[PDB]
Amino acid sequence: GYSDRARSITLGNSTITTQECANVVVGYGVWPDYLKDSEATAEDQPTQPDVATCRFYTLDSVQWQKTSPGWWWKLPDALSNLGLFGQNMQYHYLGRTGYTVHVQCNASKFHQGCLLVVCVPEAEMGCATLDNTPSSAELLGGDSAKEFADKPVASGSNKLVQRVVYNAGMGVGVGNLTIFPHQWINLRTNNSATIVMPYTNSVPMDNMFRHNNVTLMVIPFVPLDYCPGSTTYVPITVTIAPMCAEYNGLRLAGHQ
């Protein structure tokens, strides 16, 4: 006799326990694995760090306010400077991995609000200036979350990003982002959200510095609301574990 609300996930030297979880969403029904002999093209022997690379990394926390539009993180960029995962992508030319993404936000019963947590493949975004393309600094934040805007961005010969929330930066309806693997953090029912993503690409491996295979978006569809005397500072924390990570093409460290 147990409760389906309580779940524990153990990876490497890390373990996460949640007493209020909806369940786990599994990619497209596909658990991550290693590349097989009949699907490979590169011929050198791969390296598999395992426990050293496959483990939970916890990022900075963001504050959910009553007027927050939302945040986004490129998965490969998010962990590019973190531990041996970062070192291994620094010294190698090709990498391959899946993910376990855990989002955390607790609050009391009085606190209300709902967040969509979605893992979007190839989240290619658009620049405010139509002729130009969005700058790398604007598109990527390695150790910090990237924020959406509520108002439209002004286009004046710049390399900014159209970070409109109701267009999800990709010029599409935000309510239709449900085709992609996703879960909802509803403060009255939920506490955390978990998605297990497999490796998704048109090639068997890829360079991990010039391509971001997946992007994590957290978007509040219902705003945060509390009566006076309740806690006013509510953070959101993101924890990510690489899975079945392998690397090929060893050479001098650096990206150029």
């Binding site: 009085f110 209300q112 709902c114 449900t178 569809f221 609301d225 009566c227 005397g229 309740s230």
Partner: peptide, 12 residues
């Protein structure tokens, strides 16, 4: 008392 009397509902 001390809970919001205005709420929202979502549809799919």
């Amino acid at each position: 008392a001390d809970a919001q009397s205005s709420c929202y509902i979502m549809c799919f």
